[PDB]
Curated annotation (Swiss-Prot), chain A:
Interacts with TRX2, MCP and capsid vertex component 2/CVC2. GO terms for biological process: viral capsid assembly. GO terms for cellular component: host cell nucleus; viral capsid. Pfam families: Herpes_VP19C. Its main location: virion. This is Triplex capsid protein 1. It comes from the Viruses. It comes from Epstein-Barr virus (strain B95-8). It is found in: Virion; Host nucleus. One of its GO terms (molecular function) is DNA binding. Belongs to the herpesviridae TRX1 protein family. The keyword Flavoprotein does not apply. InterPro entries: Herpes_1. Structural component of the T=16 icosahedral capsid. The capsid is composed of pentamers and hexamers of major capsid protein/MCP, which are linked together by heterotrimers called triplexes. These triplexes are formed by a single molecule of triplex protein 1/TRX1 and two copies of triplex protein 2/TRX2. Additionally, TRX1 is required for efficient transport of TRX2 to the nucleus, which is the site of capsid assembly.
UniProtKB/Swiss-Prot annotation, chain C:
Self-assembles to form an icosahedral capsid with a T=16 symmetry, about 200 nm in diameter, and consisting of 150 hexons and 12 pentons (total of 162 capsomers). Hexons form the edges and faces of the capsid and are each composed of six MCP molecules. In contrast, one penton is found at each of the 12 vertices. Eleven of the pentons are MCP pentamers, while the last vertex is occupied by the portal complex. Homomultimer. Makes the hexons and eleven out of twelve pentons. Interacts with triplex proteins 1/TRX1 and 2/TRX2; adjacent capsomers are linked together in groups of three by triplexes, heterotrimeric complexes composed of one molecule of TRX1 and two molecules of TRX2. Interacts with scaffold protein; this interaction allows efficient MCP transport to the host nucleus. Interacts with capsid vertex component 2/CVC2. Interacts with the small capsomere-interacting protein/SCP. It is found in: Virion; Host nucleus. Belongs to the herpesviridae major capsid protein family. It comes from Epstein-Barr virus (strain B95-8). This is Major capsid protein.
Length: 319, 32, 49
Protein backbone atom coordinates (compact mmCIF):
# COMPACT_ATOMS: atom_id res chain seq x y z
CA UNK A 1 0.00 0.00 0.00
CA UNK A 2 3.12 2.14 0.15
CA UNK A 3 4.03 1.14 -3.39
CA UNK A 4 0.49 2.27 -4.22
CA UNK A 5 1.47 5.81 -3.24
CA UNK A 6 4.47 5.62 -5.57
CA UNK A 7 2.29 4.34 -8.42
CA UNK A 8 -0.27 7.08 -7.85
CA UNK A 9 2.54 9.65 -7.65
CA UNK A 10 3.61 8.41 -11.05
CA UNK A 11 -0.01 8.62 -12.22
CA UNK A 12 -1.57 11.75 -10.63
CA UNK A 13 -0.26 15.10 -11.86
CA UNK A 14 -1.76 16.37 -15.10
CA UNK A 15 -0.03 19.14 -17.06
CA UNK A 16 -0.70 22.50 -15.47
CA UNK A 17 -3.80 24.22 -16.82
CA UNK A 18 -3.02 27.43 -14.91
CA UNK A 19 0.25 28.96 -13.76
CA UNK A 20 0.76 32.20 -11.84
CA UNK A 21 3.43 34.08 -13.77
CA UNK A 22 4.99 37.23 -12.34
CA UNK A 23 6.90 38.59 -15.34
CA UNK A 24 7.46 37.32 -18.85
CA UNK A 25 11.11 38.36 -18.70
CA UNK A 26 12.17 35.79 -16.09
CA UNK A 27 10.87 32.71 -18.02
CA UNK A 28 10.75 30.32 -15.08
CA UNK A 29 11.19 26.57 -15.39
CA UNK A 30 7.56 26.07 -14.30
CA UNK A 31 6.11 27.98 -17.25
CA UNK A 32 8.63 26.19 -19.49
CA UNK A 33 7.28 22.90 -18.16
CA UNK A 34 3.83 24.21 -19.02
CA UNK A 35 4.54 25.41 -22.56
CA UNK A 36 6.71 22.50 -23.67
CA UNK A 37 5.17 19.75 -25.79
CA UNK A 38 7.21 16.59 -26.35
CA UNK A 39 8.40 16.17 -29.92
CA UNK A 40 7.90 13.37 -32.42
CA UNK A 41 11.29 13.10 -34.15
CA UNK A 42 14.79 12.87 -32.70
CA UNK A 43 18.22 11.59 -33.62
CA UNK A 44 19.06 7.91 -33.39
CA UNK A 45 20.86 7.76 -30.06
CA UNK A 46 19.82 6.57 -26.62
CA UNK A 47 20.05 10.10 -25.21
CA UNK A 48 17.90 11.68 -27.92
CA UNK A 49 15.31 8.89 -27.78
CA UNK A 50 15.11 9.08 -23.98
CA UNK A 51 15.00 12.89 -24.09
CA UNK A 52 12.22 13.12 -26.66
CA UNK A 53 10.42 10.32 -24.82
CA UNK A 54 9.20 8.39 -27.84
CA UNK A 55 9.13 5.05 -26.03
CA UNK A 56 6.44 6.11 -23.55
CA UNK A 57 3.23 4.08 -23.92
CA UNK A 58 0.21 5.67 -25.54
CA UNK A 59 1.48 9.24 -25.43
CA UNK A 60 4.93 10.79 -25.18
CA UNK A 61 6.44 11.29 -21.71
CA UNK A 62 10.09 11.77 -20.75
CA UNK A 63 11.83 9.54 -18.20
CA UNK A 64 -3.88 12.50 -22.64
CA UNK A 65 -3.09 16.22 -22.92
CA UNK A 66 -5.93 16.88 -25.36
CA UNK A 67 -3.70 16.11 -28.36
CA UNK A 68 -4.40 13.27 -30.69
CA UNK A 69 -1.64 11.78 -32.84
CA UNK A 70 -2.55 11.52 -36.53
CA UNK A 71 -3.02 8.37 -38.55
CA UNK A 72 -1.46 7.99 -41.97
CA UNK A 73 -3.01 6.40 -45.03
CA UNK A 74 -0.45 4.65 -47.21
CA UNK A 75 -1.33 4.56 -50.90
CA UNK A 76 0.41 3.05 -53.91
CA UNK A 77 -0.34 4.76 -57.22
CA UNK A 78 1.00 4.69 -60.74
CA UNK A 79 3.58 7.39 -61.42
CA UNK A 80 1.69 8.49 -64.53
CA UNK A 81 -1.62 8.92 -62.69
CA UNK A 82 -0.15 11.50 -60.31
CA UNK A 83 1.84 14.67 -60.88
CA UNK A 84 4.95 14.96 -58.71
CA UNK A 85 4.80 18.75 -59.05
CA UNK A 86 1.77 18.82 -56.76
CA UNK A 87 1.81 20.76 -53.52
CA UNK A 88 2.02 18.95 -50.20
CA UNK A 89 -1.28 19.89 -48.62
CA UNK A 90 -3.78 18.96 -51.28
CA UNK A 91 -6.84 16.81 -50.57
CA UNK A 92 -6.99 13.62 -52.57
CA UNK A 93 -9.73 11.16 -53.50
CA UNK A 94 -9.25 7.42 -53.63
CA UNK A 95 -11.50 5.77 -56.19
CA UNK A 96 -12.64 2.29 -55.21
CA UNK A 97 -11.41 0.08 -58.03
CA UNK A 98 -13.69 -2.72 -59.20
CA UNK A 99 -11.14 -5.52 -59.22
CA UNK A 100 -11.11 -8.00 -56.30
CA UNK A 101 -7.35 -7.71 -55.71
CA UNK A 102 -5.52 -4.61 -56.90
CA UNK A 103 -2.39 -3.79 -54.93
CA UNK A 104 -2.26 -0.41 -56.67
CA UNK A 105 -4.96 2.08 -55.71
CA UNK A 106 -6.07 5.18 -57.63
CA UNK A 107 -6.06 8.65 -56.09
CA UNK A 108 -7.07 11.98 -57.59
CA UNK A 109 -6.19 15.56 -56.85
CA UNK A 110 -9.02 18.01 -57.65
CA UNK A 111 -6.87 19.21 -60.52
CA UNK A 112 -6.73 15.62 -61.77
CA UNK A 113 -10.37 15.16 -60.81
CA UNK A 114 -11.22 18.07 -63.11
CA UNK A 115 -9.97 16.40 -66.29
CA UNK A 116 -12.18 13.38 -65.77
CA UNK A 117 -15.10 15.80 -65.97
CA UNK A 118 -13.72 17.97 -68.76
CA UNK A 119 -13.16 15.46 -71.54
CA UNK A 120 -16.27 14.45 -73.33
CA UNK A 121 -16.97 18.19 -73.40
CA UNK A 122 -7.45 29.57 -65.67
CA UNK A 123 -8.17 26.36 -63.80
CA UNK A 124 -8.61 24.21 -66.90
CA UNK A 125 -5.45 25.61 -68.51
CA UNK A 126 -3.36 24.62 -65.49
CA UNK A 127 -5.17 21.27 -65.31
CA UNK A 128 -4.41 20.42 -68.94
CA UNK A 129 -0.88 21.76 -68.45
CA UNK A 130 -0.18 19.42 -65.53
CA UNK A 131 -1.63 16.18 -66.92
CA UNK A 132 -1.15 16.00 -70.67
CA UNK A 133 -3.44 13.08 -71.52
CA UNK A 134 -6.84 12.45 -69.91
CA UNK A 135 -6.97 8.93 -71.33
CA UNK A 136 -4.27 7.78 -68.92
CA UNK A 137 -6.62 8.93 -66.15
CA UNK A 138 -9.97 8.01 -67.73
CA UNK A 139 -9.09 4.30 -67.63
CA UNK A 140 -8.49 4.31 -63.87
CA UNK A 141 -12.23 4.65 -63.67
CA UNK A 142 -13.03 1.81 -66.08
CA UNK A 143 -16.67 2.72 -66.80
CA UNK A 144 -16.90 6.43 -66.10
CA UNK A 145 -19.80 7.12 -68.44
CA UNK A 146 -22.09 4.46 -66.99
CA UNK A 147 -21.18 5.37 -63.40
CA UNK A 148 -21.94 9.03 -64.03
CA UNK A 149 -25.05 8.02 -65.98
CA UNK A 150 -26.71 6.05 -63.18
CA UNK A 151 -25.55 8.64 -60.59
CA UNK A 152 -23.41 6.24 -58.56
CA UNK A 153 -20.19 8.24 -58.66
CA UNK A 154 -20.41 9.57 -55.12
CA UNK A 155 -20.41 6.19 -53.39
CA UNK A 156 -17.41 4.93 -55.36
CA UNK A 157 -15.13 7.87 -54.51
CA UNK A 158 -14.29 8.35 -50.88
CA UNK A 159 -12.22 11.30 -49.65
CA UNK A 160 -8.89 10.59 -48.01
CA UNK A 161 -7.67 13.91 -46.64
CA UNK A 162 -4.62 15.92 -47.62
CA UNK A 163 -1.25 14.61 -48.70
CA UNK A 164 1.86 14.84 -46.54
CA UNK A 165 4.59 12.65 -48.06
CA UNK A 166 5.20 12.01 -51.76
CA UNK A 167 8.34 10.09 -52.63
CA UNK A 168 9.45 10.66 -56.21
CA UNK A 169 9.58 7.10 -57.48
CA UNK A 170 9.71 6.26 -61.17
CA UNK A 171 6.96 3.68 -61.79
CA UNK A 172 4.80 3.05 -58.72
CA UNK A 173 4.44 6.07 -56.46
CA UNK A 174 3.81 5.73 -52.74
CA UNK A 175 2.08 8.71 -51.17
CA UNK A 176 1.14 9.20 -47.54
CA UNK A 177 -2.03 10.96 -46.50
CA UNK A 178 -3.69 11.87 -43.22
CA UNK A 179 -7.14 10.28 -43.20
CA UNK A 180 -7.91 11.49 -39.66
CA UNK A 181 -6.41 13.73 -37.05
CA UNK A 182 -4.08 16.73 -36.88
CA UNK A 183 -2.53 17.28 -40.29
CA UNK A 184 1.18 17.88 -39.73
CA UNK A 185 4.07 17.11 -42.04
CA UNK A 186 6.52 14.28 -41.43
CA UNK A 187 9.69 16.16 -42.31
CA UNK A 188 12.90 16.20 -40.27
CA UNK A 189 12.72 19.98 -40.08
CA UNK A 190 9.11 19.86 -38.93
CA UNK A 191 7.42 22.47 -41.11
CA UNK A 192 3.73 23.21 -41.29
CA UNK A 193 1.47 22.12 -44.13
CA UNK A 194 -1.42 24.08 -45.65
CA UNK A 195 -4.40 22.40 -47.29
CA UNK A 196 -4.60 23.81 -50.82
CA UNK A 197 -7.83 23.80 -52.82
CA UNK A 198 -7.94 25.59 -56.21
CA UNK A 199 -9.82 28.85 -56.08
CA UNK A 200 -12.45 28.40 -58.79
CA UNK A 201 -13.44 25.07 -57.24
CA UNK A 202 -13.58 26.59 -53.74
CA UNK A 203 -16.54 28.92 -53.28
CA UNK A 204 -17.03 30.33 -49.79
CA UNK A 205 -20.43 29.98 -48.15
CA UNK A 206 -20.16 32.34 -45.20
CA UNK A 207 -19.49 35.33 -47.46
CA UNK A 208 -21.94 34.02 -50.06
CA UNK A 209 -24.76 35.05 -47.74
CA UNK A 210 -22.99 38.38 -46.93
CA UNK A 211 -22.86 37.36 -35.22
CA UNK A 212 -21.97 34.24 -33.07
CA UNK A 213 -18.53 33.37 -34.43
CA UNK A 214 -17.61 29.76 -33.63
CA UNK A 215 -14.15 28.24 -33.64
CA UNK A 216 -14.35 25.17 -35.90
CA UNK A 217 -15.37 26.15 -39.43
CA UNK A 218 -15.72 22.95 -41.42
CA UNK A 219 -14.70 22.36 -45.03
CA UNK A 220 -17.23 20.53 -47.19
CA UNK A 221 -16.45 18.86 -50.50
CA UNK A 222 -19.44 18.51 -52.79
CA UNK A 223 -19.92 16.30 -55.80
CA UNK A 224 -22.85 17.38 -57.94
CA UNK A 225 -24.25 15.91 -61.13
CA UNK A 226 -24.53 18.33 -64.04
CA UNK A 227 -25.55 18.05 -67.66
CA UNK A 228 -22.07 19.40 -68.44
CA UNK A 229 -20.55 16.48 -66.53
CA UNK A 230 -20.16 16.26 -62.75
CA UNK A 231 -18.43 18.93 -60.72
CA UNK A 232 -16.30 18.85 -57.58
CA UNK A 233 -16.84 22.01 -55.55
CA UNK A 234 -15.51 22.87 -52.10
CA UNK A 235 -17.48 24.72 -49.42
CA UNK A 236 -16.25 26.37 -46.25
CA UNK A 237 -18.87 26.90 -43.59
CA UNK A 238 -19.06 27.66 -39.89
CA UNK A 239 -22.32 25.78 -39.35
CA UNK A 240 -23.72 22.32 -38.73
CA UNK A 241 -24.36 19.45 -41.11
CA UNK A 242 -28.08 20.02 -40.61
CA UNK A 243 -27.44 23.59 -41.72
CA UNK A 244 -25.11 22.60 -44.51
CA UNK A 245 -27.50 20.42 -46.49
CA UNK A 246 -30.25 23.05 -46.27
CA UNK A 247 -27.99 25.90 -47.36
CA UNK A 248 -26.38 23.75 -50.05
CA UNK A 249 -29.80 22.88 -51.46
CA UNK A 250 -30.50 26.63 -51.47
CA UNK A 251 -27.13 27.25 -53.16
CA UNK A 252 -27.79 24.62 -55.84
CA UNK A 253 -31.43 25.73 -56.37
CA UNK A 254 -30.77 27.06 -59.92
CA UNK A 255 -28.67 24.07 -60.92
CA UNK A 256 -31.27 21.41 -60.05
CA UNK A 257 -33.91 23.02 -62.24
CA UNK A 258 -31.23 23.55 -64.89
CA UNK A 259 -30.46 19.82 -65.00
CA UNK A 260 -34.18 19.05 -64.83
CA UNK A 261 -35.08 21.42 -67.66
CA UNK A 262 -32.43 20.24 -70.10
CA UNK A 263 -32.89 16.51 -69.33
CA UNK A 264 -36.01 14.83 -68.00
CA UNK A 265 -35.06 12.17 -65.42
CA UNK A 266 -36.67 9.38 -67.43
CA UNK A 267 -35.57 6.67 -64.98
CA UNK A 268 -35.53 6.43 -61.20
CA UNK A 269 -31.78 6.73 -60.57
CA UNK A 270 -31.22 10.19 -62.06
CA UNK A 271 -32.89 11.99 -59.16
CA UNK A 272 -29.82 12.26 -56.91
CA UNK A 273 -28.13 15.65 -57.24
CA UNK A 274 -24.87 14.31 -55.88
CA UNK A 275 -23.70 14.39 -52.30
CA UNK A 276 -21.53 16.24 -49.81
CA UNK A 277 -19.02 15.18 -47.18
CA UNK A 278 -17.35 16.98 -44.28
CA UNK A 279 -13.59 16.95 -44.78
CA UNK A 280 -12.83 18.18 -41.26
CA UNK A 281 -12.53 21.31 -39.18
CA UNK A 282 -10.25 24.31 -38.96
CA UNK A 283 -10.12 27.65 -37.18
CA UNK A 284 -12.74 30.14 -38.33
CA UNK A 285 -10.52 33.19 -37.75
CA UNK A 286 -7.35 32.66 -39.81
CA UNK A 287 -8.97 30.30 -42.27
CA UNK A 288 -8.46 30.23 -46.02
CA UNK A 289 -5.67 32.70 -46.70
CA UNK A 290 -5.43 33.14 -50.46
CA UNK A 291 -2.19 32.22 -52.21
CA UNK A 292 -0.93 31.01 -55.59
CA UNK A 293 0.36 27.75 -57.06
CA UNK A 294 3.05 28.11 -59.71
CA UNK A 295 3.88 25.44 -62.24
CA UNK A 296 6.78 25.96 -64.66
CA UNK A 297 4.54 27.71 -67.18
CA UNK A 298 1.50 29.25 -65.53
CA UNK A 299 -0.01 30.00 -62.14
CA UNK A 300 -3.56 29.65 -60.88
CA UNK A 301 -5.12 31.07 -57.72
CA UNK A 302 -5.51 28.54 -54.93
CA UNK A 303 -6.85 28.86 -51.41
CA UNK A 304 -4.57 27.85 -48.53
CA UNK A 305 -6.41 26.57 -45.49
CA UNK A 306 -3.88 26.48 -42.68
CA UNK A 307 -3.85 24.11 -39.67
CA UNK A 308 -6.46 21.67 -40.92
CA UNK A 309 -7.82 18.85 -38.77
CA UNK A 310 -8.80 16.24 -41.34
CA UNK A 311 -11.92 14.22 -40.51
CA UNK A 312 -13.78 12.62 -43.39
CA UNK A 313 -17.42 11.59 -43.27
CA UNK A 314 -19.82 9.52 -45.32
CA UNK A 315 -21.71 10.97 -48.27
CA UNK A 316 -24.90 12.89 -47.48
CA UNK A 317 -26.98 13.25 -50.64
CA UNK A 318 -28.18 16.67 -51.72
CA UNK A 319 -31.30 16.10 -53.90
CA UNK B 1 69.38 17.53 -68.69
CA UNK B 2 65.64 17.12 -68.16
CA UNK B 3 64.06 13.66 -68.49
CA UNK B 4 62.11 13.42 -71.73
CA UNK B 5 58.92 11.47 -71.04
CA UNK B 6 58.90 9.23 -74.12
CA UNK B 7 59.32 5.47 -74.41
CA UNK B 8 62.39 4.22 -76.27
CA UNK B 9 62.49 0.85 -78.01
CA UNK B 10 65.47 -1.11 -79.28
CA UNK B 11 65.45 -2.08 -82.96
CA UNK B 12 68.77 -3.84 -83.44
CA UNK B 13 71.44 -1.16 -83.34
CA UNK B 14 69.21 1.93 -83.22
CA UNK B 15 67.27 2.89 -80.10
CA UNK B 16 64.42 4.98 -81.42
CA UNK B 17 61.84 6.80 -79.32
CA UNK B 18 58.05 6.46 -79.42
CA UNK B 19 55.84 9.35 -78.33
CA UNK B 20 52.11 10.15 -78.66
CA UNK B 21 50.89 13.81 -78.87
CA UNK B 22 47.22 12.59 -78.68
CA UNK B 23 46.86 13.80 -75.10
CA UNK B 24 48.54 17.07 -76.06
CA UNK B 25 45.88 17.54 -78.78
CA UNK B 26 42.68 16.35 -77.12
CA UNK B 27 42.84 19.17 -74.56
CA UNK B 28 42.28 21.63 -77.41
CA UNK B 29 39.42 19.63 -79.03
CA UNK B 30 41.33 19.56 -82.35
CA UNK B 31 41.42 16.77 -85.01
CA UNK B 32 44.65 14.72 -84.58
CA UNK C 1 43.79 26.08 -74.36
CA UNK C 2 43.83 26.36 -78.13
CA UNK C 3 46.35 25.62 -80.83
CA UNK C 4 47.49 28.47 -83.03
CA UNK C 5 47.17 27.82 -86.75
CA UNK C 6 49.23 29.36 -89.49
CA UNK C 7 46.62 28.73 -92.15
CA UNK C 8 43.75 31.10 -92.73
CA UNK C 9 40.89 30.01 -90.50
CA UNK C 10 38.30 31.65 -88.29
CA UNK C 11 40.33 31.12 -85.13
CA UNK C 12 39.00 30.19 -81.73
CA UNK C 13 39.62 32.59 -78.86
CA UNK C 14 40.18 31.75 -75.19
CA UNK C 15 37.34 29.36 -74.48
CA UNK C 16 36.34 28.57 -70.91
CA UNK C 17 33.59 26.23 -69.77
CA UNK C 18 31.62 26.82 -66.58
CA UNK C 19 29.88 23.56 -65.69
CA UNK C 20 27.90 22.88 -62.52
CA UNK C 21 26.55 19.68 -61.02
CA UNK C 22 23.77 19.56 -58.44
CA UNK C 23 23.33 17.18 -55.55
CA UNK C 24 20.97 14.26 -55.28
CA UNK C 25 18.78 13.76 -52.23
CA UNK C 26 17.94 10.19 -51.27
CA UNK C 27 15.55 9.59 -48.39
CA UNK C 28 16.10 6.10 -47.05
CA UNK C 29 13.75 4.68 -44.41
CA UNK C 30 12.09 1.64 -42.85
CA UNK C 31 9.10 1.16 -40.58
CA UNK C 32 9.75 -1.07 -37.58
CA UNK C 33 7.18 -1.88 -34.92
CA UNK C 34 7.23 -2.21 -31.15
CA UNK C 35 4.44 -3.84 -29.18
CA UNK C 36 2.74 -1.96 -26.36
CA UNK C 37 3.34 -4.95 -24.08
CA UNK C 38 7.05 -4.17 -24.52
CA UNK C 39 6.76 -0.46 -23.69
CA UNK C 40 4.68 -0.40 -20.52
CA UNK C 41 7.18 -2.69 -18.81
CA UNK C 42 10.05 -0.58 -20.13
CA UNK C 43 8.84 2.59 -18.38
CA UNK C 44 8.06 0.80 -15.11
CA UNK C 45 10.31 -0.46 -12.31
CA UNK C 46 9.63 -3.94 -10.90
CA UNK C 47 10.51 -5.45 -7.53
CA UNK C 48 10.25 -9.20 -8.28
CA UNK C 49 12.82 -11.56 -9.87
Amino acid sequence: RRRLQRRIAGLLPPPARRLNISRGSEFTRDVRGLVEEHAQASSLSAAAVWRAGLLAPGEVAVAWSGWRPPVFGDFLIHASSFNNAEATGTPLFQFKQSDPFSGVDAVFTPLSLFILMNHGRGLTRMANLLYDSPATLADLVPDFGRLVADRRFHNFITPVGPLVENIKSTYLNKITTVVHGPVVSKAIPRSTVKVTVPQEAFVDLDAWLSQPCPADARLYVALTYEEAGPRFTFFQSSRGHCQIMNILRIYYSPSIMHRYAVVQPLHIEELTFGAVACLGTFSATDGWRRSAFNYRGSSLPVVEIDSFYSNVSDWEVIL
Amino acid sequence: RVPISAAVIKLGNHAVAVESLQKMYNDTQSPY
Amino acid sequence: PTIAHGDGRRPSKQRTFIVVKNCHKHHISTEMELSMLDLEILHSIPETP
